[PDB]
Amino acid sequence: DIGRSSVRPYLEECTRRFQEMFDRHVVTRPTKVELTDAELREVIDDCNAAVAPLGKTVSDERWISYVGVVLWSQSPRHIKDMEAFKAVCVLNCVTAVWDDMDPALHDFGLFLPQLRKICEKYYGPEDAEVAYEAARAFVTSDHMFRDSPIKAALCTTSPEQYFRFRVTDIGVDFWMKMSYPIYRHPEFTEHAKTSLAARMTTRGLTIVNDFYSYDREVSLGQITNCFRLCDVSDETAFKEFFQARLDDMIEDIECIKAFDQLTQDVFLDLIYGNFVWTTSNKRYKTAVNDVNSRIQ
Amino acid sequence: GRSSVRPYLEECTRRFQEMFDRHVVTRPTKVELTDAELREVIDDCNAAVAPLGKTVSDERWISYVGVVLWSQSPRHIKDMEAFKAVCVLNCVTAVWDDMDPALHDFGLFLPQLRKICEKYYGPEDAEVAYEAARAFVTSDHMFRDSPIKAALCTTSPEQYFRFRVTDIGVDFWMKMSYPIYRHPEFTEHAKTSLAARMTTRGLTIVNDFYSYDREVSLGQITNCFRLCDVSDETAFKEFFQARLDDMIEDIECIKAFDQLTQDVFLDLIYGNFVWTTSNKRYKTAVNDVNSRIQA
Numbered sequence A: 001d002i003g004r005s006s007v008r009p010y011l012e013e014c015t016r017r018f019q020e021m022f023d024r025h026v027v028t029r030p031t032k033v034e035l036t037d038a039e040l041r042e043v044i045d046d047c048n049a050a051v052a053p054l055g056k057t058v059s060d061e062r063w064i065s066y067v068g069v070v071l072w073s074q075s076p077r078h079i080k081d082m083e084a085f086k087a088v089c090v091l092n093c094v095t096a097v098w099d100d101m102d103p104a105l106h107d108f109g110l111f112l113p114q115l116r117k118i119c120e121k122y123y124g125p126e127d128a129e130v131a132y133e134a135a136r137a138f139v140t141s142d143h144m145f146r147d148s149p150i151k152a153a154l155c156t157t158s159p160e161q162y163f164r165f166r167v168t169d170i171g172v173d174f175w176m177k178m179s180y181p182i183y184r185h186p187e188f189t190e191h192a193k194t195s196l197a198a199r200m201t202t203r204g205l206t207i208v209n210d211f212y213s214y215d216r217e218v219s220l221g222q223i224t225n226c227f228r229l230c231d232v233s234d235e236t237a238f239k240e241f242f243q244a245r246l247d248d249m250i251e252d253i254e255c256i257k258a259f260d261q262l263t264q265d266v267f268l269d270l271i272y273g274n275f276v277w278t279t280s281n282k283r284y285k286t287a288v289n290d291v292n293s294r295i296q
Numbered sequence B: 001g002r003s004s005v006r007p008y009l010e011e012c013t014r015r016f017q018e019m020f021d022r023h024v025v026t027r028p029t030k031v032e033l034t035d036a037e038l039r040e041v042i043d044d045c046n047a048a049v050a051p052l053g054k055t056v057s058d059e060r061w062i063s064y065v066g067v068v069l070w071s072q073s074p075r076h077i078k079d080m081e082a083f084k085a086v087c088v089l090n091c092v093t094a095v096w097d098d099m100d101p102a103l104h105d106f107g108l109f110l111p112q113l114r115k116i117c118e119k120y121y122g123p124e125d126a127e128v129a130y131e132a133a134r135a136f137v138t139s140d141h142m143f144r145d146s147p148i149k150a151a152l153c154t155t156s157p158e159q160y161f162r163f164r165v166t167d168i169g170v171d172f173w174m175k176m177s178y179p180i181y182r183h184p185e186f187t188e189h190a191k192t193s194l195a196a197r198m199t200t201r202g203l204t205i206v207n208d209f210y211s212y213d214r215e216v217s218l219g220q221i222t223n224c225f226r227l228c229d230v231s232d233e234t235a236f237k238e239f240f241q242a243r244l245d246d247m248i249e250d251i252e253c254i255k256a257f258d259q260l261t262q263d264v265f266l267d268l269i270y271g272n273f274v275w276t277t278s279n280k281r282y283k284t285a286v287n288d289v290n291s292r293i294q295a
């Protein structure tokens, strides 16, 4: 129970083992994108404008905590479109607010038009439609699976059922479909649109996020977390589960290395950069705080 | 030795059927097209593949189209124009799947896919259907001799079925079939591809078993039974049971979806099995309705 309410006893060791895995299997360190003050302010003002119809104010410190995943987990050496980068910054942030909101305040009529306005600001006409549909599908999925029997079944049955749910629910399909304009790389664009890009990266993103967001999520009655599949109060069982998940991440990373050079660079910067950001995000460091609290 | 699953044909067919009777129960049913409807479908198919220069016989079309007739969910059909579109799109992209890639002319074929979608679908639905068709034929082409395909199909079942979510065409299927039903929940699962991911393994394991002999003889590697030594009876049976286990788990989780959506999901998997066991394409290594379409 309370023994199952936290992965704190494993925090240091799992962090060390995560990093050791990346040093061995990815090697290349992720890179932080440095926005100018003008760029950061533009992103944040677009974020505020988009969530203002929903009546909640979001502090700069909160936005900065949301945006760090984009700053850390894109692929700076391959960036060609900084407008598409800023779009991903904004879209990520405003839908992370949605992910944190009480569903009672999920106003599709007010929010969906703001998502379209973002896409139309930053993307060409064709890209705007691809990014928008993926944003729409992400916020719709997050809404419709709150207290759903489907989510309960897919999250409590097996790791295979759980990660299949997370391809969409964690947002990585959305991410790939709004991020391919950053790179203008033909192969990457196709893997993004088939969702093979998302499926290749789902476990490495999800396992890392689930470990560090476990304590917050169980305190909030949130069940979408693979470590609820094991008794985290049982050290031996946890260790076995955790090794199985490292094995999952490793197999994925090695198969990702079969993709073309630019595509695998982007895929691996995403997985490894998310890890680096996750270990520095105060959202993931106490059960409830001013940057991870539920938005009432 | 590993060239054939023929020794297991009878047992595996019986066990598939037993599994379905225990876990699905509800039988699929065949859509009966009128003569005019079937002729409209076949005319559109021929018109679409005509620019590619290879004639396709009525018998071959009827072979391709059976999967749509058997694997939709007739109780819930509301839009027979969308149904006919799925018939045409399935068949013409099946021809593409059988073609030598030297014959893959995107500039001639892609506008034929758009013309089909624009005939049968509303404007939003036509874009969704067309994008999925484009994605399907581009994937089939770009993976024909790709190291990515080798890596995903030789590493583990997990990597293989991940590749099949697109390659077998099921994501395509869901995104062009939701208009048949106009069921709001089904439409969203189609668009997230959750629908496709729930049904991939039950469709792929069946198709792989019955297309193994043909595929191995053409040097096609996209088949999960190449992950086991099919010449080792003990190893095969262990592998085959693990695949039955996968289908069973998927089906039991599908039953958590809403009633109509799960009817559609399970009719797809079980109807595909019914059609596969009566399609002559899946009965010899090469015959006149499964031969490679070479240049």
Ligand SMILES: [Cl-]
Pocket: A221, A222, A223, A224
């Ligand atoms: Cl949750």
Ligand SMILES: [Cl-]
Pocket: B219, B220, B221, B222
């Ligand atoms: Cl193949």
Ligand SMILES: [Mg+2]
Pocket: A099, A142, A169, A170
């Ligand atoms: Mg979430």
Ligand SMILES: [Mg+2]
Pocket: A099, A100
């Ligand atoms: Mg969350």
Ligand SMILES: [Mg+2]
Pocket: A209, A210, A213, A214, A217
């Ligand atoms: Mg989380």
Ligand SMILES: [Mg+2]
Pocket: B097, B140, B167, B168
């Ligand atoms: Mg194929």
Ligand SMILES: [Mg+2]
Pocket: B097, B098
């Ligand atoms: Mg084939």
Ligand SMILES: [Mg+2]
Pocket: B207, B208, B211, B212, B215
């Ligand atoms: Mg096959």
